[PDB]
Amino acid sequence: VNTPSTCCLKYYEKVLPRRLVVGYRKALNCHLPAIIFVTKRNREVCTNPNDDWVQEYIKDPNLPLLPT
Amino acid sequence: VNTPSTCCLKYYEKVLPRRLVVGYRKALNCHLPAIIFVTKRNREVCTNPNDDWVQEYIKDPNLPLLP
Ligand code: NA
């Protein structure tokens, strides 16, 4: 659309501890496709959708998809 | 900064009525640099920073930058 999107410009280079993550948002339609993890520290973290740990957290039955 | 940004993926293709817009945001460090207009209904519209009308609108002291 002509409406702005939430998009990532860089990927996080480390693994977020699972215990710190409370949800995720999809930002896959951007120039750099990303998954954004929402944390207990009230931070939003851009990550590589293709990385193994990211796909593990996405598949976690207790982690909700949140809107952007 | 691994924090998300607000970015535009395409530009609106018409000229917005000035009466409709109430502020603007800058999204120039994106793959497609844009000026985002905010409407009185709090909708956001992506536009080309280089269009003459866009620059004239944002130069208006009564149309503020909203970060
Ligand atoms: Na202005």
From Swiss-Prot, chain A:
Entry's induction text: By IL10/interleukin-10.
Tissues expressing this chain: Mainly expressed in liver, also found in spleen and thymus. Highly expressed in LPS- and IFN-gamma-activated monocytes, weakly in some lymphocytes, including natural killer cells, gamma-delta T-cells, and some T-cell clones.
UniProtKB keywords: Chemotaxis, Cytokine, Disulfide bond, Inflammatory response, Secreted, Signal
Localization terms from the record: Secreted
Coiled-coil intervals, chain numbering: none
Single Gene Ontology MF annotation: CCR chemokine receptor binding
Main localization of the protein described in the UniProt heading: secreted
Disulphide bridges, residue numbers: C7-C30, C8-C46
Domain of life: Eukaryota
Any one GO cellular component localisation term in the record: extracellular region
BP term (GO), one: cell communication
Function as written in the Swiss-Prot or TrEMBL entry: Shows chemotactic activity for lymphocytes and monocytes but not neutrophils. Also shows potent myelosuppressive activity, suppresses proliferation of myeloid progenitor cells. Recombinant SCYA16 shows chemotactic activity for monocytes and THP-1 monocytes, but not for resting lymphocytes and neutrophils. Induces a calcium flux in THP-1 cells that were desensitized by prior expression to RANTES.
Family: Belongs to the intercrine beta (chemokine CC) family.
Protein name (Swiss-Prot/TrEMBL): C-C motif chemokine 16
